[PDB]
Write a protein that binds this ligand. Structure first.
Ligand SMILES: [Mg+2]
Lengths: 129, 160, 111, 157, 78
RNA sequence: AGCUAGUAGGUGGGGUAACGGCUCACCUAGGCGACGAUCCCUAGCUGGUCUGAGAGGAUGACCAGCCACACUGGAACUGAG
RNA sequence: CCGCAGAAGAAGCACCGGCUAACUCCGUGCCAGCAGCCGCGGUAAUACGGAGGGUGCAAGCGUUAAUCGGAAUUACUGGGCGUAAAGCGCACGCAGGCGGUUUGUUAAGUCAGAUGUGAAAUCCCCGGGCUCAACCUGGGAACUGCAUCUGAUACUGGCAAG
RNA sequence: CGGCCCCCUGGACGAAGACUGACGCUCAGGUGCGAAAGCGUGGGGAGCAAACAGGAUUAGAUACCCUGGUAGUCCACGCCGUAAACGAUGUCGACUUGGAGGUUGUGCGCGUGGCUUCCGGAGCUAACGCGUUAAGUCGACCGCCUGGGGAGUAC
């Protein structure tokens, strides 16, 4: 039984980038389309669409640059068995600012830089590099 | 015979200790305060070692030997702001005033040695005067005005 | 990893036994040098009777079979069961004569 | 302005019907004053011959990478053949803090402020391969902006 | 007014109420949030509770042995 | 691995500077406990000291805040204490 | 503070094959002995003892004992379980940990702001007098931990529910 | 766990239609099954054969070789909870180049499922090797490890 759809999406796109595939489909959710939107805003993918009505499908196409994968390391830091909550002043700097991290905060879903510039923190969920 | 990097590090360390007459625990506390100090460590430590009182007397020119300089310091012949100092590890602050005791005016051998030092070299700082027996500090010692055959990187790696 | 099992049973750090298993937290301990012969060892019953083996170094094989000696911790790496060393130079333990080098060793006085 | 620093000399031995044939192997890394590093693993029956073979191998396989004024662009983790190394940037008044082989290869590369630590095994060939792979996998803000499609100002803030 | 919210266990104590509260605390060396079932003894007026209902508790003066609590509101109607 | 019988609570009385099974009489038949009850071993606690890049680990003399004791074991009187 | 006198009375400890800093001569023949580890003594021991010299420290120097790091060698940060230590012989099942997707609500976890509170000395920075220093001392910062109030709802909790 | 037949009965899988609508996953404790050997009681006992006897090689042979043969191996009712109980790889899921096949269906001479065998791409390890049935990337949980002997040993 699957216990983490977000981590399943992350490992799906990671092995898709490793296999150099075109597109990937998955079941959808509000937090899934939110993290997909903030990932597109950060600029790691091109686009994502929702298909179907009774079973929403997040069809997303991957990105490649110079024959290499755009992402290098994706890691889920807020496990469903080990949640992680850090305040605003102790938000980490992934790769000293070169990487990125997703943070589920009180004002929706944003990144570490957006959380610092907005002035609030929350559950930091994933590291993307 | 050629010793490795640790060997040449300790050789340069003991060379500095021999040419400055400084024991090991003194240089260890010197390295401690230098690592406490701001900015760099090795060249600031060299500046502190230059700010050693016997070295500052030798490089002002009141004695052409650090041994007789320490002898004169122990005999209390250097008056900073009028008061004597017996301790050889006294640090000299910049733009200060140092003077020679009146009982130390009976001086000919180290005065001829001062003339010999004037014949040998002439640094930038440490203005000296043989007649008035006075002296002052001009500014901080420069890293380029610091003498050669000194390496800070191997020293700070040996004591790090 | 396995944080549920770790919070159910906590990670227990492994204990570290002392290399000197007799009269711990003590640099030098007393004792009676019984059997000062075989082959350079004494069976020392200490102040509480832990009955250690000790190695004798240098001269002084004529030490008394009931003599107060001091014991320091040290493995000889040449004999089994020898983990202690006699402290030559202590009370009732005649220091090794004719050893003018290593003054701190054997407690020898210099001329 | 290239530098010369040997890091490992070992004495291997093969067995033949006549007896034992001893040989000398030399690991030695070299490089330029900034960025370009390359390590060489030579093996011969004479020590200077093996040193020169390792030197030629290193000058052939000298790899290129960038940096940021004598420090890492970001903390990297070099993992190869059972050797974990941690490359981490530092402040200006630090120096070079690393192992033996890592300190030598970083002093060859010409960094000024890098703190490091070598976990895992302590094999010289393995740790130099690990730190070379870590430096090679280390990227730059310009190339990550070109890969993400954004600008350097948007990626810095 | 500093009241707390809890859940009772039994109500067969002849005008005495045993409550239990739960808290999620981050572990100081493991980080995993676990539960802490802190049980308390509460004094009531006329046995206005049943088995397993959510109530509100208030700290007051000591009324018996390790029982210095009073009931405020019942948000379950048992 | 089950423990507790003044045990857990209520009613009335006593007493304490003071609430309170604190203590009695009568009822209710319960209270705690694998989130470790009970039992056994060790141990004064904290600001701190050492060490460690950190998180931690070890350690509570001299300097201070709190607790307990004055050969051992029981008590109460004076006194505001 | 001032004078006086013959420099007058004022120096050792450990090691030199390597790790780890610096060599020779004699005794020595697995013997006495050294040794933290690799370990040495084959009538030539750079490794035992003696002589010199040098090395390192210095009114201290060696040895022992105790704690932390190195040790990622109890791994949350920061590890593994095919063959090196290590997947219960297998299955079912209670507590317990996790829970597919959407709406309404609570803020319990979560975060933001504010207030109170973390004795005083040590600790960090700026200064002062101790001949300098050790020492003590003024100010600042740290003590970010705890508690209360008001807000947020993305997610994890609960209910009504699809 | 395989000679055939009858009776009773479990589980698995396939193509479709409908319903319940998260009823789900691991499980500490507990329960059940659990190879062979062995034990208790009652039977049977052909062949094999622990123990044992004799003959052989051998320097000796309490062993390997033959001659016989008790227990056991066969049945029923209960214990015994141990194995190199191994795929030395715990269970449930998600995603990630292919060939050669085997078995068993279902649909339209061809398509898609379940299980399984061999080699190999990426990837992972110290290598051997694994490699869509991963030892690849992950998610949930349990169990076990942390130098060898002592020792799976004493109380
Ligand atoms: Mg037979």
């Amino acid at each position: 039984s699957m216990q983490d759809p977000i981590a399943d999406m992350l490992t799906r796109i990671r092995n898709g980038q490793a296999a150099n595939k075109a597109a990937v489909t998955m079941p959808s959710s509000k937090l899934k389309v939110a993290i997909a939107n903030v990932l597109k805003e950060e600029g790691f993918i091109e686009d994502f669409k929702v298909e179907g009505d009774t079973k929403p499908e997040l069809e997303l196409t991957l990105k490649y640059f110079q024959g290499k994968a755009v992402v290098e390391s994706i890691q889920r830091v807020s496990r469903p068995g080990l949640r992680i909550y850090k305040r605003k002043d102790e938000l980490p700097k992934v790769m000293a600012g070169l990487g990125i991290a997703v943070v589920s905060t009180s004002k929706g879903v944003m990144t570490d830089r957006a959380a610092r510039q907005a002035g609030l923190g929350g559950e930091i969920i994933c590291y993307v590099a | 015979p050629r010793i490795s990097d640790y060997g040449v590090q300790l050789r340069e360390k003991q060379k500095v200790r021999r040419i400055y007459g400084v024991l090991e625990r003194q240089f260890r506390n010197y390295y401690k305060e230098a690592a406490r100090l701001k900015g760099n460590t090795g060249e600031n430590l060299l500046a502190l070692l230059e700010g050693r009182l016997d070295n500052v007397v030798y490089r002002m020119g009141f004695g052409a030997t650090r041994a007789e300089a320490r002898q004169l310091v122990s005999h209390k012949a250097i008056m900073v702001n009028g008061r004597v100092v017996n301790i050889a590890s006294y640090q000299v602050s910049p733009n200060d005033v140092v003077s020679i005791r009146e009982k130390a005016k009976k001086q000919s051998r180290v005065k001829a040695a001062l003339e010999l030092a004037e014949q040998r070299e002439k640094p930038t700082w440490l203005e000296v005067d043989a007649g008035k027996m006075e002296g002052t500090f001009k500014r901080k010692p420069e890293r380029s005005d610091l003498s050669a055959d000194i390496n800070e990187h191997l020293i700070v790696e040996l004591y790090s | 990893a396995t944080v549920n099992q770790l919070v159910r049973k906590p990670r227990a750090r492994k204990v570290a036994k002392s290399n000197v298993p007799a009269l711990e937290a003590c640099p030098q301990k007393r004792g009676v040098c019984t059997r000062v012969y075989t082959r350079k060892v004494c069976r020392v019953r200490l102040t509480n009777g832990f009955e250690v083996t000790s190695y004798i170094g240098g001269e002084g094989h004529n030490l008394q079979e009931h003599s107060v000696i001091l014991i320091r911790g040290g493995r000889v790496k040449d004999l089994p069961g020898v983990r202690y060393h006699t402290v030559r130079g202590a009370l009732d333990c005649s220091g090794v004569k004719d050893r003018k080098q290593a003054r701190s060793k054997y407690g020898v006085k210099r001329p | 302005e290239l530098q010369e620093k040997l890091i490992a000399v070992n004495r291997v031995s093969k067995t033949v019907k006549g007896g034992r044939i001893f040989s000398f192997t030399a690991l030695t890394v070299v490089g330029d004053g900034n960025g370009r590093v390359g390590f060489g693993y030579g093996k011969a029956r004479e020590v200077p011959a093996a040193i020169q073979k390792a030197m030629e191998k290193a000058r052939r396989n000298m790899i290129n990478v960038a940096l940021n004024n004598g420090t890492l662009q970001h903390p990297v983790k070099g993992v190869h053949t059972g050797s974990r190394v941690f490359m981490q940037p530092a402040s200006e008044g630090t120096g070079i803090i690393a192992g033996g082989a890592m300190r030598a290869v970083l002093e060859v590369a010409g960094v000024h402020n890098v703190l490091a630590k070598a976990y895992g095994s302590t094999n010289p060939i393995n740790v130099v391969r690990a730190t070379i792979d870590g430096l090679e996998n280390m990227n730059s803000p310009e190339m990550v902006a070109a890969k993400r499609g954004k600008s350097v100002e948007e990626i810095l803030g | 007014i500093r009241t707390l919210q809890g859940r009772v266990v039994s109500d067969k104590m002849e005008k005495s109420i045993v409550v239990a509260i739960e808290r999620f605390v981050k572990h100081p060396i493991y980080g995993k949030f676990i539960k802490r079932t802190t049980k308390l003894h509460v004094h009531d007026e006329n046995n206005e509770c049943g088995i397993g209902d959510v109530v509100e508790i208030r700290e007051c003066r000591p009324l018996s042995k390790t029982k210095s609590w009073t009931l405020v509101r019942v948000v379950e109607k048992a």
